[PDB]
Symmetry: none
Subunit: 214 residues, 2 copies
């Protein structure tokens, strides 16, 4: 199958900037390439067909170029409605393969997270499961690490993480890490902590509690 490689994987730019993203095919495909745009939680939209032709409604700020293997899409002046993920797709031979995408985010200053730890409620404990919650609020960039420690022992494979998209409020990100254990296991231990490392912190910040505090 024809492999499509997009570059870069992500791009931090400001409103009004001129950006250019690239898509390379493993074989020559003439101008048989489409450019799609997709915002989080919304359906994709075909922006450019035949490598260069814009579809109806698309502003002239988007321009597609390239023939053969290397193709580019250029946004002349980024607008708030242009920050999204962009995909390329070859239509030359079956299977019609997609690139893995290029995500455009709004660049801003580094922001340290606000970290909070919350023990499980007694109601959930009465069901036999215990969920310790660690919240990281309003940080930039999106890359953060959360490490759960129980009685000063590293935990792994027992946590779930959810991360928000770039907030329309302040262009930050928020994250939740839930460590879920059995009631028996939870009661077998005392000190529960989440250690957060982020670019905005001089040293990793640990939020901890002894079992019993609420």
């Amino acid at each position: 199958d024809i492999q499509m490689t997009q570059s870069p994987s992500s791009l931090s730019a400001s409103v009004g900037d001129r950006v250019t993203i690239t898509c390379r095919a493993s074989q020559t495909i003439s101008n048989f390439l489409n450019w799609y745009q997709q915002k989080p939680g919304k359906a994709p939209k075909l922006l450019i067909y035949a490598a260069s032709t814009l579809q109806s409604g698309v502003p002239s700020g988007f321009s597609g170029s390239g023939s053969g293997t290397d193709f580019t899409l250029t946004i002349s002046s980024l607008q708030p409605e242009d920050f999204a993920t962009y995909y390329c797709q070859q239509t030359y031979s079956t299977p019609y393969t997609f690139g893995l995408g290029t995500k455009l985010e709004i660049k801003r200053t580094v922001a340290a997270p606000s970290v909070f730890i919350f023990p499980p409620s007694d109601e959930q404990l009465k069901s036999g499961t215990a969920s310790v919650v660690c919240l990281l609020n309003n940080f930039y960039p999106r890359e953060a690490k959360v490490q759960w420690k129980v009685d000063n022992a590293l935990q792994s494979g027992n946590s779930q993480e959810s991360v928000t998209e770039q907030d329309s409020k302040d262009s930050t990100y928020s994250l939740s890490s839930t460590l879920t254990l059995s009631k028996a296991d939870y009661e077998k231990h005392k000190v529960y902590a989440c250690e957060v490392t982020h670019q905005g912190l001089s040293s990793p910040v640990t939020k901890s509690f002894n079992r019993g505090e609420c």
Copy 2:
């Protein structure tokens, strides 16, 4: 433009279930219809073109049918890798419009949400806008209700909600409810509460703070 309408918007199923998704066009498009599949945070994948022709590599469990305005995609025995969002797209007349999608989610046990309330930060108040956040963490199903109360006055028309997609491990959801007031109106009132109603909560849980 040709409007593509998909149904249902969401569908809860389990491994081994047989499921069907419908896509309708506002006008006849013969068989110029594509079915794409896409998992959250991942690139889309074209599964079917020409309404019925499966793409190279798709298992035989996927079946496309239809010609004209009504089209269906059928999955015989749902596998874990089948739970995703499916889009249809007409390829007859420009612009080649997409449907709004069908999110095929997995069924799990009822999980009550954990509720947290966060007041705005002073660094946010320097924008003249106060955003009070109520977070619901790890719940199932998605159906939930968040009612805002400012000084025991039920609010409306100024709160927005954002829901995550189904988690790939615990199959739960998480929701944010932001009440957006002006800085002066925020400094004009006292108690701020969010009341959460969910299938996993016999009594609605209220989380509040007092400035």
